[PDB]
Symmetry: C2
Subunit: 117 residues, 2 copies
Amino acid sequence: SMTNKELQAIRKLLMLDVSEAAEHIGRVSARSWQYWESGRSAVPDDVEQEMLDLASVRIEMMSAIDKRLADGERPKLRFYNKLDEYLADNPDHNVIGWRLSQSVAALYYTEGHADLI
Amino acid sequence: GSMTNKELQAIRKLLMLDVSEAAEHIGRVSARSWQYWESGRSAVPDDVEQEMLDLASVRIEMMSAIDKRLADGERPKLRFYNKLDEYLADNPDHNVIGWRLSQSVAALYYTEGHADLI
Ligand SMILES: [Cl-]
Ligand SMILES: [Cl-]
Ligand SMILES: [Mg+2]
Ligand SMILES: [Mg+2]
Ligand SMILES: [Mg+2]
Ligand SMILES: [Mg+2]
């Protein structure tokens, strides 16, 4: 029962642009995605579940870094600012995985735990 | 002053700032100048770095109060504002930067499963 504001919140947390979420998750125009965030139309079940699954991936990514911190390591995390460079290192990923990687790396940098390269 | 261009972009995005908002309020520069700081074309100014680190500290303070409610077994209802003026009505001594920080905190706890958004 994700609301319009909850969709927007998770989309922003995952560092997706509207156009990226619209193209790949919604398979709709950016305008149609904006309508789900504005509440003009209900958030589709399939879109809700996909946002939740992507959040679960992000959690798995964080649990792994947490173990490195528990070991005393100060990780050097890749912050890719070029999609093509992310994809060259992750040939089976796409723009969604790129944004997830940014969200995770930014969290640990901002918390003071990791350095970005 | 050791924050890199990518670290600036990372913290700016984590705090949910649009480039234009960061440029106007934190940089006191054009959007293009802020973009140059994120792309590496121009060095990140020391004072910009410090304001961004200070904003991260503000965000930590905001999260610590929520964490204490979670420790009591509460499921908070966090306000997710999607209009600046509605945030300001409840937070009249704040600005657009404060609004974005409030979104970043509410979105974190909602996405991690601990809070509902209203
Ligand atoms: Cl609304
Ligand atoms: Cl609140
Ligand atoms: Mg691989
Ligand atoms: Mg450093
Ligand atoms: Mg206040
Ligand atoms: Mg609910």
